[PDB]
Design a protein around this ligand. Structure first.
Ligand SMILES: COc1cc(/C=C/CCCN2CCCN(CCC/C=C/c3cc(OC)c(OC)c(OC)c3)CC2)cc(OC)c1OC
Ligand SMILES: COc1cc(/C=C/CCCN2CCCN(CCC/C=C/c3cc(OC)c(OC)c(OC)c3)CC2)cc(OC)c1OC
Lengths: 249, 244, 241, 222, 244, 196, 204, 232
């Protein structure tokens, strides 16, 4: 182990482009579609589980990850970059927030921490950037519900709703048309389901798509009763059944 | 495009590592050396090219011992081979130190194997320009191994490498056929001297000096020892009878 | 063209050539393996080829016993295969020490996948030219097959195969499960689950095997083990009916 | 401080008293000494209270991350191995004395861990300055195959042994029950046998009774 | 070796220019323009957003105006995430100075420090420079109201008015035309709006493409208020100043 | 505490009382001092419980890693990992350990590792605080190649005397039998060994 | 020799109906020698009030440190820190120095701006949290303070009353401690406003 | 164009290390030096090379211990580094084990030390060749060291410019000088002879001649100037 690569691998080109950030974004463009939508009483996040063999068990691979009990992520791009990124993001929510304030971070701050991790990989010695874009959805007490997109550059922005990956321009367009500020969480799941139907080729059921919400508190997911201040996680991933049920619609 | 063969850890588009393959060319340009696994031990022999009458016999020893029970011999870039033995020695000491029992041969093989492999992982180093034939007797009997610059190694009934290696393999293949029951320690040395002699023809324009060593349960108490004096000359004379 | 073809940085199309090229290194052994799940066991079978009469046939293996409960089969050149095993072995012991329980198959896989992915992101290191297939009867999950590649991907398989002739075996198995409607080989005996796996191996590959041509690993409840030539022979007899 | 843990047929219960002391002074007459490591693994602590809190929240956090990473429910045997290896590192300078109880997919568990890093396993355990009173009661009334309700009674009484008989223990009884197929049940002030009696007077002062030199409203907001 | 892959981010061109700094500056010209204008009774910061969608949440958005401290704000042009890391650093430096001296850090000191980190990347490290240019609006008791800018090179300068990013020369010419020292804040507000609508490569200036902040006194306190404008407050001034 | 390991014809048996004490207070009366570091390699622990649990945990880890690389470790090797940890950390350990195990090549083996980090291969080994009282007894009663029943009795009697005299010992007598047949756990209660 | 006893001083906090109060003495001394009569031990960060007793150089350092930290908090979070969150920040900060601690006894008081509920807490010098709902005491007259509080305190006192109560608790307890006194300040705290009064007391 | 010679980490497709081979070239340009041995002694004769006619002739012989020394041909700062490192290894053998380092073992150390410089990025091989003479517990010894890492034991050899003259002269003289036991001056005469078979134009001066002798009851000693006159 003699890492001699202590110089940037992203450098400015004469035009002013960051080559490796662009190519990274290009890898994101090629990845499967995922989307998020914000209602008044929740946020939904959706994506297509594209099975790489029917011999593969797709329940062994969630594409939607819990970060804190009030925050979930979904991505489009390279999987193993997302996997790693989720681990690191769970840990900074502890090391840099939980272990200091006894609370989990608010959506913006965890996002910002994620952004920082990604920014570092577009500047530090001997690394390429990440080739994912994440949509991060969440709730907190003073900010309420939010939904953030974070790009390989480390840049992030809040959305009323948006999509990333293949049919990001189509889906985005479809979302502006159906989005108002009076949407209920149940309406946004419906919209997300539709938006996904477009970019999905083959079978479209509760086994080929993946949905999660940041909604109300689920004390049935807490695991203990006693403290009346702890009400349970607002993140909930949906089952095959709940997806299929909403499909009769 | 092109230039996949300039840096050490680079996969070519067909999934190969050209620098390793180049290192192998340095092995092939080496003198030939072999190992014969008998029924209770292993013999090691090697070709020592006599460039001039100025050399001293038999004072340029190539076979090396690791710990007390392991013989190593190699073909190719020699200083690379010593560097590898050095690492084998530290590794075998470290093993004995902690586990008390002297290192078993497969354990020891893997130690060099992981370390050779390691030099095919970064562009900060080059692979080892040597193939190494080594072995001895552990608690589980006799073991013979050969180790390539890629980190590849396997157990052998007999092994050869370097210049005269294909004559040698044909010779070892023959013995493997006629003796499916086992070669004896004393026979394996005589036979080993023949094969070096035979393999010397790829190099016939220079004179050669012979080296043999054995680790044998019944002939050396499982300790690695060199063939010297009478026993050596007895095997030289056997060789010079079989070439006529 | 470019250096973007020599190290693990993005090409303008957003791809990593070194990753793709490493996937090619996996095949240069021309060894095929499949894995299958029984009721309470898990079987890997891989081709054994000893091209040289001078080799010791007992030393030629691409099945590794990682822990008491985890076996790993490797499609790729042995130097990289051994490097990976050594890690997994080291990584699974440490796990146990730190956390007081045996490392789960899926988890060791997630670990090795993460190490793999860092090689795709850091320039000083090359990926390894191997595809790793992990098997066990997990104490919480039941029989498990988990595979990782040099991209850093990892998946849960109901059955799987790997090698040059991978696609043959794969479709063969896809078809068997399409009729079966169950995600495993409905058999209580691990030796009838080995026989099954040697059978479908035979069809897809269109070839016959002697006892020296296969390698077999079995993973039961709290044991993973490899069959000898003779335990294999015993299956090879019983199949020929 | 008195803390106990009792195994019963389908789970495990831990109990503690609610008294925090600084020397001979009672600083909190209702301290919660039952800590959460994971939702179904709980802890009672005795020793330096900053340490018992510090160590359960740390191992608590690592346990959560391990859980998310392996996608498995946390195991007691893990919180044990992690606690004890942290404690051992610090040669007892981390003065945490701990009874760790929980249910996981392998069953129900009860351990004690000492500041120096030694661990014990049993069906009933106690620690604290009330350790002895409590263990006398447990040695007197324990049997195998306790019902849930029996094991609460037992653990509850043992704490009372320390509340009454030990000067270092006092006030209320906190209990947590974790049963194999159910949510951990946490009973804050399960028992409150120590209510203060009504004062013989009210000590409200007539307003103006305090002598003041200066007033000034304070600027909260910039 | 690995030497071949090094772009050498930190060397001179034969003109004595820093390749990467110039290339970074070229990157910054593609970023939404920001304006700082300093009046007798305060400072104005206006900037146009690169990112626009009807679905972009703007109540909770920020890419241009950041608070460093209660006396100092900064307007950004370039890599948002590159600016984010420099910003954080600068917040810490302001607090470190406060902890040390028990006074709020004077604007220039905070600017020099941040500029000096920037310059460091241009002389050692082999790392790409930060793709960021800042305008700093601030107030201390030595120099009153102040404007400064810094760019990837490490250079900073002081200004009565200035702009960074896209169409800077246009903007630098339009400001230099109509700026006077007697400018009041309500005046400076208008001029910065006027300049942005005459530079924008977009159809017009809507409230949703704008970030806007003012550092003044509250007429009652002799104290320093930093007001960042909400979307509805920005729309107010667009109707007001007559851009509807 | 009182601990011993004795070799016999068919293998080796480890024994121990079950009392750990903090001063005069019996902190634990059902302690398990017989500790598995491998399938057929066990140890008797005495000294600091923390030091001694931690050492065993590390040795368990080492031999497990050994096993996956080089197959089954010798009893002698288990003893070596122990000695190495105890000797090189002699300033910060209070551990006295008897290592015992079974091979088919080697049969039963016993190594004692005392406070030194010295290591000693013995036909039998006593240790712990209760051990002093039975030095004479055991020297008069150990015979080599005893039967399993003989050996279980030799340990029963010795340990009942050690428990009788040493107040640091007591509770139950635990044994672990290591033979080719495998691994057998035995227990003996007060009412049984007291009246011997 | 005892770092928590070189400088002297006390802090008491109290919760009443829709209010909280926090008080401290003004003394700073070196052992027997009275140095300053103006050393206050109650600081605030936004609407969170923190009282510190103990070694004076640490009281100072800790205040500077919590200013620094609550500044970066407001900057990143865009809101003022709440009492419960702060209390956690104090605890984790003191524990950072577990084997070389700051020689102080901190006390937090305030009103949650969202939940409205009054809040007080106390800690030892390494961060263990006293989570009491009635009163928290700290310093060299912490014993006297306990005795006075247990008697004088009744719950749900209106601000005007709670002021009388907390002042009398502080005053008499400081008069039974050689190392405390020389003046006093009381903060009455509500959601709307915070009043600060300096008490008159014997100057010996 | 050669793509395979820009550092030592790179093998050529024929399996060669060009950077090592370019180092060897420095030696072959260095001034000639000759070593030879009987069963009792071992002599180093070296032709020193001046720059101008106003310059000193550069010292080609270095003592490493009382029983061992070398001559250098090539990049001399490197010979300083290697001879220095060998001085230490001799020292260490004497201090720790009270034992004179066997000549054969000095060779091993130099070899392993040279090899490391042929396998790592940023490094560069040694640009010097060495002739090692010593008398240890196994009698007289002569070693030749090349920066490749190769060390070989011989009765005689020469390295540097025109070395082949001496080299062949030694091959014919072999059976003659191998018998010069007990007479150093006869062993040196043979050594100073041989070095003349590499003398193209200039002849041995009392200023360009350098000579070292070691053996049975003779510690390594260096003769230059007046002391060397009697052999020329
Ligand atoms: C030198 O070698 C020896 C050492 C010993 C052992 C001496 C002392 C034993 C160890 N301990 C001493 C006693 C103290 N201890 C603490 C256990 C639990 C503390 C309960 C507790 C009490 C409190 O109030 C005081 C608490 O509130 C602060 C609290 O926190 C919640 C917890 C455990 C450890 C005994 C020996 O034989 C006779 C001996 O041989 C010569
Ligand atoms: C069974 O578990 C336990 C283990 C232990 C701990 C056992 C360790 C004993 C510690 N030592 C006793 C053994 C002996 N010892 C040193 C010997 C003293 C003689 C002084 C001496 C000094 C020298 O230094 C110069 C010598 O060299 C010349 C020398 O010549 C032999 C002798 C010191 C240390 C204690 C227990 O409680 C009672 C216990 O019961 C639960």
């Amino acid at each position: 182990m003699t890492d001699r690569y202590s110089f940037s691998l992203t450098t400015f080109s004469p035009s002013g482009k960051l080559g490796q950030i662009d190519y990274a974004l290009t890898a994101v463009k090629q990845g499967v579609t995922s989307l998020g939508i914000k209602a008044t009483n929740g946020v939904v996040i959706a994506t297509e589980k594209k099975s790489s063999s029917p011999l593969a068990m797709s329940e062994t691979l969630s594409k939607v990850s819990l970060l804190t009990p009030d925050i979930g992520a979904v991505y489009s791009g390279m999987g193993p970059d997302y996997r790693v990124l989720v681990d690191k993001s769970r840990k900074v929510a502890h090391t840099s927030y939980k272990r200091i304030y006894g609370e989990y971070p608010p959506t913006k701050l965890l996002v910002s921490e994620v952004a920082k991790i990604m920014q570092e990989a577009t500047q530090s010695g001997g690394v390429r950037p990440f080739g994912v874009s994440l949509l991060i959805a969440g709730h907190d007490e003073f900010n309420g519900f939010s939904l953030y997109q974070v790009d390989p550059s480390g840049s992030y922005f809040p959305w009323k709703a948006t999509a990333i990956g293949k049919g990001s321009v189509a889906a985005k367009t479809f979302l502006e048309k159906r989005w108002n500020d009076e949407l209920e969480l149940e309406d946004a799941i419906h919209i997300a389901l539709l938006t996904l139907k477009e970019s999905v080729e083959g079978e479209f059921n509760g086994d080929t798509i993946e949905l999660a919400i940041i909604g109300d508190e689920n004390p049935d997911l807490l695991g203990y009763t006693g403290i009346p201040t702890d009400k349970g996680p607002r993140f909930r991933k949906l089952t095959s059944q709940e997806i299929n049920d909403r499909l009769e619609a | 495009g092109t230039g996949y063969d300039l840096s050490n850890s680079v996969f070519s588009p067909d999934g190969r590592n050209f620098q390793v393959e180049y290192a192998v060319k340095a092995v092939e340009n080496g003198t030939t050396s072999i190992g014969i696994k008998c029924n209770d031990g292993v013999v090691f022999a090697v070709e020592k090219l006599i460039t001039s009458k100025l050399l001293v016999p038999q004072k340029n020893v190539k076979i090396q011992v690791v710990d007390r029970h392991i013989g190593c011999v190699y073909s190719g870039l020699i200083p690379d081979g010593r560097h590898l033995v050095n690492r084998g020695r530290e590794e075998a000491a470290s093993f004995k130190k902690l586990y008390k029992t002297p290192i078993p041969i497969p354990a020891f093989a893997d130690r060099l194997g992981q370390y050779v492999q390691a030099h095919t992982l970064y562009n900060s180093v080059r692979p080892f320009g040597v193939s190494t034939i080594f072995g001895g007797v552990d608690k589980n009997g006799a073991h013979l191994y050969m180790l390539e610059p890629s980190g590849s190694y396997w157990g052998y009934k007999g092994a050869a490498t370097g210049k005269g290696r294909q004559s040698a393999k044909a010779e070892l293949e023959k013995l493997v056929d006629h003796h499916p029951e086992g070669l004896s320690a004393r026979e394996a040395v005589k036979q080993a001297a023949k094969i070096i002699y035979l393999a010397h023809e790829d190099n016939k324009e220079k004179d050669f000096e012979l080296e043999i060593s054995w680790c044998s349960l019944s002939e050396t108490n499982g300790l690695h020892k060199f063939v010297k004096g009478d026993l050596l000359q007895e095997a030289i004379d056997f060789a010079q009878k079989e070439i006529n | 063209a470019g250096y973007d073809r020599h190290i693990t940085i993005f090409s303008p199309e957003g791809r990593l050539y070194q990753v793709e090229y490493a996937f090619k290194a996996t095949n240069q052994t021309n060894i095929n393996s499949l894995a299958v799940r029984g009721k309470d066991c898990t079987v890997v079978i891989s081709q054994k080829k000893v091209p040289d009469k001078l080799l010791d046939p007992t030393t030629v293996s691409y099945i590794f016993c990682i822990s008491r409960t985890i076996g790993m089969v490797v499609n790729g050149p042995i130097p990289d295969a051994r490097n990976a095993a050594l890690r997994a072995k080291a990584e699974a012991a440490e796990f146990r020490y730190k956390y007081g329980y045996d490392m789960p198959c899926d988890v060791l896989a997630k670990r090795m996948a993460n190490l793999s992915q860092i090689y795709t992101q850091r320039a000083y290191m090359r990926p390894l030219g191997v595809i790793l297939t992990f098997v066990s009867v997990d104490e919480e999950l039941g029989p498990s097959i988990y595979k990782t590649d040099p991209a850093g991907y990892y998946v849960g398989y109901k059955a799987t195969a790997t090698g040059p002739k991978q696609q043959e075996i794969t479709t063969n198995l896809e078809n068997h499960f399409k009729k079966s409607k169950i995600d495993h080989i409905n058999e209580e005996s691990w030796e009838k689950v080995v026989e099954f796996a040697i059978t479908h191996m035979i069809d897809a590959l269109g070839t016959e095997f002697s006892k020296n041509d296969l390698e077999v690993g079995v993973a039961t409840k709290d044991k993973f083990f490899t069959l000898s030539a003779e335990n294999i022979e015993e299956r090879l007899v019983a199949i020929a009916e | 401080t008195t803390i106990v843990g009792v195994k019963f047929n389908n789970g495990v219960v831990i109990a503690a008293d609610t008294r925090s002391t600084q020397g001979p002074i009672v600083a909190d007459k209702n301290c919660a000494k039952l800590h959460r490591i994971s939702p179904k693994i709980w802890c009672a602590g005795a020793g330096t209270a900053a340490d018992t809190e510090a160590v359960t929240q740390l191992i608590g956090s690592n346990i959560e991350l391990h859980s998310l990473y392996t996608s498995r429910e946390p195991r007691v045997v893990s919180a044990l191995q992690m606690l004890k290896q942290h404690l051992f590192k610090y040669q007892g300078h981390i003065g945490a004395y701990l009874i760790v109880a929980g249910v996981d997919p392998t069953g129900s568990h009860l351990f004690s861990i000492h500041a120096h890093g030694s661990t014990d396993v049993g069906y009933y355990l106690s620690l604290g300055s009330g350790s002895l009173a409590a263990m006398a009661v447990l040695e007197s009334h324990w049997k195998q195959d306790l019902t849930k309700e029996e094991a609460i009674k037992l653990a509850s009484d043992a704490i009372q042994a320390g509340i009454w008989n030990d000067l270092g223990s006092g006030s209320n009884v906190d209990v947590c029950v974790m049963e194999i197929g159910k949510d951990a049940e946490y009973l804050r002030n399960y028992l409150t046998p120590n209510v203060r009696e009504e004062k013989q007077k009210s000590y409200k002062f007539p307003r103006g009774t305090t002598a003041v030199l200066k007033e000034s409203i304070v600027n909260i907001c910039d | 070796g690995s030497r071949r892959y090094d772009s050498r981010t930190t060397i001179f061109s034969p003109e004595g220019r820093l390749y990467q700094v110039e290339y970074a500056l070229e990157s910054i010209s593609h970023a939404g323009t920001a304006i700082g204008i300093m009046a007798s009774d305060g400072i104005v910061l206006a900037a146009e957003r690169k990112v626009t969608s009807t679905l972009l949440e703007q109540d909770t958005s920020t890419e241009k105006l950041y608070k460093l401290n209660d006396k100092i704000a900064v307007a950004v042009a370039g890599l948002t995430a590159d600016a984010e890391i420099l910003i954080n650093t600068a917040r810490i430096h302001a607090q470190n100075y406060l902890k040390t001296y028990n006074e709020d850090i004077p604007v220039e000191i905070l600017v020099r420090r941040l500029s000096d980190i920037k310059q460091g990347y241009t002389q050692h490290g082999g790392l790409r420079p930060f793709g960021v240019s800042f305008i700093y609006a601030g107030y201390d008791d030595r120099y009153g109201y102040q404007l400064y800018t810094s760019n990837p090179s490490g250079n900073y300068t002081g200004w009565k008015a200035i702009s960074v990013g896209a169409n800077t020369s246009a903007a630098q010419t339009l400001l230099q035309m109509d700026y006077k020292d007697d400018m009041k804040v309500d005046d400076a507000i208008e001029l910065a709006l006027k300049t942005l609508s005459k530079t924008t490569d977009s159809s017009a200036l809507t409230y949703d493409r704008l970030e806007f902040a003012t550092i003044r006194k509250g007429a009652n306190d002799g104290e320093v208020y930093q007001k960042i404008f909400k979307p509805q407050e920005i729309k107010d001034i667009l109707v007001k100043t007559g851009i509807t | 505490t009182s601990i011993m390991a004795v070799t016999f014809k068919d293998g080796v048996i480890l024994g121990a009382d079950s009392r750990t004490t903090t001063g005069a207070y019996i902190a634990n009366r059902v302690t398990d001092k017989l500790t598995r570091v491998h399938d057929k390699i066990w140890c008797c622990r005495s000294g600091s419980a923390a030091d001694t649990q931690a050492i065993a945990d590390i040795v368990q880890y080492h031999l497990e890693l050994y096993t996956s690389q080089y197959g089954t470790p010798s009893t002698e090797t288990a003893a070596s990992v122990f000695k190495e940890l105890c000797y090189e950390n002699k300033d910060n350990l209070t551990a006295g350990i008897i290592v015992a195990g079974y091979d088919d090549k080697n049969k039963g083996e016993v190594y004692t590792i005392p406070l030194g980090g010295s290591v000693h291969k013995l036909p039998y080994a006593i240790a712990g605080s209760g051990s002093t009282f039975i030095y004479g007894y055991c020297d008069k009663n150990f015979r080599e190649n005893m039967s399993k029943e003989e050996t279980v009795d030799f340990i029963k009697h010795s340990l009942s005397q050690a428990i009788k005299w040493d107040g640091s010992s007591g509770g139950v007598i635990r044994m672990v039998v290591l033979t080719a047949a495998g691994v057998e756990r035995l227990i003996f209660y007060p009412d049984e060994y007291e009246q011997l | 020799s005892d770092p928590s006893s070189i400088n002297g001083g006390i802090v008491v906090a109290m919760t009443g109906k829709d209010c909280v109060a926090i008080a401290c003495d003004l003394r700073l001394g070196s052992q027997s020698l009275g140095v300053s009569n103006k050393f206050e031990k109650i600081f605030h960060y936004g609407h969170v009030f923190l009282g510190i007793t103990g070694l004076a150089t640490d009281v100072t350092t800790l205040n500077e440190m919590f200013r620094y930290k609550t500044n970066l908090y407001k900057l990143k979070e865009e809101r003022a820190i709440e009492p419960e969150t702060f209390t956690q920040l104090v605890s984790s900060s003191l524990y950072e120095r577990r084997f070389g601690p700051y020689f102080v006894g901190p006390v937090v008081a305030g009103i949650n701006s969202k939940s409205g509920k009054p809040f007080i807490a106390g800690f030892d010098l390494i961060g263990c949290i006293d989570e009491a709902k009635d009163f928290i005491v700290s310093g060299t007259a912490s014993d006297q303070l306990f005795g006075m509080c247990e008697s004088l305190y009744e719950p749900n006192l209106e601000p005007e009353d709670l002021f009388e109560t907390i002042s009398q608790a502080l005053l008499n307890a400081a008069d039974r401690d050689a190392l405390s006194g020389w003046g006093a300040v009381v903060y009455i705290i509500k959601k709307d406003e915070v009043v600060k009064r300096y008490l008159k007391m014997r100057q010996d | 164009r050669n793509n395979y010679d820009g550092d030592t980490v790179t093998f050529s497709p024929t399996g060669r290390l060009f950077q090592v081979e370019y180092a060897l070239e420095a030696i072959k340009q260095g001034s000639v030096t000759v070593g030879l041995r009987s069963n009792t002694h071992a002599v180093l004769v070296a032709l020193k090379r001046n720059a101008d006619e106003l310059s000193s002739y550069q010292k080609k012989i270095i003592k490493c211990d009382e029983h061992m020394g070398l001559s250098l041909a090539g990049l001399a700062p490197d010979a300083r580094v290697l001879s220095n490192y060998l001085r230490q290894q001799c020292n260490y053998s004497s201090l720790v084990f009270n034992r004179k380092l066997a000549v054969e073992r000095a060779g091993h150390l130099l070899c392993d030390k040279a090899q490391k410089n042929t396998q790592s990025y940023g490094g560069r091989p040694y640009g010097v060749g060495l002739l090692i003479i010593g008398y240890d517990k196994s009698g007289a010894h002569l070693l030749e060291f090349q920066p490749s890492g190769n060390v070989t034991e011989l009765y005689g050899t020469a390295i540097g410019a025109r070395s082949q003259g001496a080299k062949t002269y030694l091959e014919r003289t072999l059976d003659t000088f191998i018998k010069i036991d007990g007479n150093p001056d006869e062993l040196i005469k043979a050594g100073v002879e041989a070095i003349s078979q590499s003398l193209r134009d200039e002849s041995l001066t009392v200023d360009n001649l350098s000579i070292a002798i070691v053996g049975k009851d003779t510690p390594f000693t260096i003769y230059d100037g007046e002391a060397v006159a009697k052999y020329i």
